[PDB]
């Protein structure tokens, strides 16, 4: 059940942008969203694909585990960053797309369709490149069916062994206090232009003390500068919640 | 292992008794402060829920990484333990009297066995099945610590590898995109002047893609001297490049 609180709608007016949050506390029956028609509409998932990528990976066999070395060859990549060898959840977090798209080749199409099938994400249409179908293909996921899945993840409940979702977790860490934790991924298809904007993505979950909760955003980015309100719009919205500190 | 005596100009300023002890990859490459002290034994204190952890979750005490430690709403030593708490939240928060009850589940027959698998320092739990780690014969070193923690970061223990990854998470206290810490604290108590009490800071730290398994221990006989168990490991690292 999910049930639409429209004065969330006042961080991305605001900011002047145009976007959805699901917030759920405890589980994917408690969802909360300022608006229920976007919270359903289904968006490239750009890079929160690496979240299902590495755990097929690991299920296929193609990453070896969690302490495999992803060697760079010496030839230029897009992004300076990515220009180093790298851990998994190194490439998670930096976001390494080169790393994802070998991965992807090595899974391949017939594998891949399976694990999406297994995992029910989003409209499941990798058409077009095995390596590109989450950057600029057909594959589409709504912040509903992100809620669903990282619940899924959080509980083991993937099929996938308890190891592998294990070990996918840990590599999302990105916020750590004694009784503060936060796995996320954001994701970036690009800057578009104005009638034609590209979306960005922000995506996990926060354990504080005994709680969880699950969320994902997304928004129309038409501005290089608006990318960081991936973060600070959630944000807000959690700590008016009360979920950040007390 | 070699010796750094350079290294000991960290704990000079404050004049700690201690030793730090940090190897590269793994543990045959180690190098420490005081090679003496390296391999001399201590109370672990809470550096035990490491163990323990694990063993609760093995035997089933833990039924998995999502069980809630309800508090029974009766009075803890620590105001921070006063309160339901994860598994992580237990370790992170050092709360005492979860452990405690988890011990007394396991129980010593089982606790035994665990402890010689994991070839856990003296392996001597004698005293009281609920404060052997805190107030009894239970000895471990620094080196031992750091062979353990390598042993849990390669999936090793004799214990499953979702256990040791449950643990593990539970053990992260720093993130960044290519940096991540795993460590745990741990402080028997003041003692005496002539008899310290000992204070500790054990974990792994893994920059891009190198890994530093780490303890550090010292003498401790006042409780405003307790941050330096975190500060003097952590500025040796940072002079190393780690960080």
């Known amino acids: 059940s999910i049930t639409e609180n429209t004065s969330w709608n006042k961080e991305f007016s605001a900011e002047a942008v145009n976007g959805v949050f699901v917030l759920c506390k405890s589980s994917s029956k408690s969802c909360a969203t300022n608006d229920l028609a976007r919270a359903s509409k289904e968006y490239l998932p750009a890079s929160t694909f690496k979240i299902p990528n590495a755990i097929i990976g690991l299920e296929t066999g193609v990453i070896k585990n969690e302490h495999q070395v992803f060697k760079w060859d010496g030839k230029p990549r897009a992004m300076k960053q990515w220009e180093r060898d790298l851990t998994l959840r190194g490439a998670i977090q930096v976001s390494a ?24 994400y989003g409209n499941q249409n990798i058409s077009g490149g095995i390596d590109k179908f989450w950057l600029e293909g057909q594959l589409r996921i709504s912040a ?22 294990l070990i996918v977790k840990e590599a999302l860490v990105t916020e750590a206090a004694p009784e503060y934790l936060v796995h996320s991924k954001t994701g970036f298809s690009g800057v578009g232009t104005e009638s034609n904007p590209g979306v960005a993505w922000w995506v996990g979950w926060v354990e504080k003390e005994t709680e969880v909760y699950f969320f994902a955003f997304n928004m129309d980015i038409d501005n290089e500068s608006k990318l960081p309100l991936r973060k600070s719009i959630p944000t807000k919205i959690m700590e008016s919640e009360g979920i950040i500190g007390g």
């Open 97 to 120: 797309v080169p790393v994802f798209q070998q991965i992807a080749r090595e899974v391949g199409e017939v594998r891949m369709q399976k694990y999406l099938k297994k995992f029910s």
């Open 144 to 165: 509903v069916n992100q809620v669903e899945f990282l619940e899924s993840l959080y509980l083991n409940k993937l099929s996938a062994s308890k190891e592998n979702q």
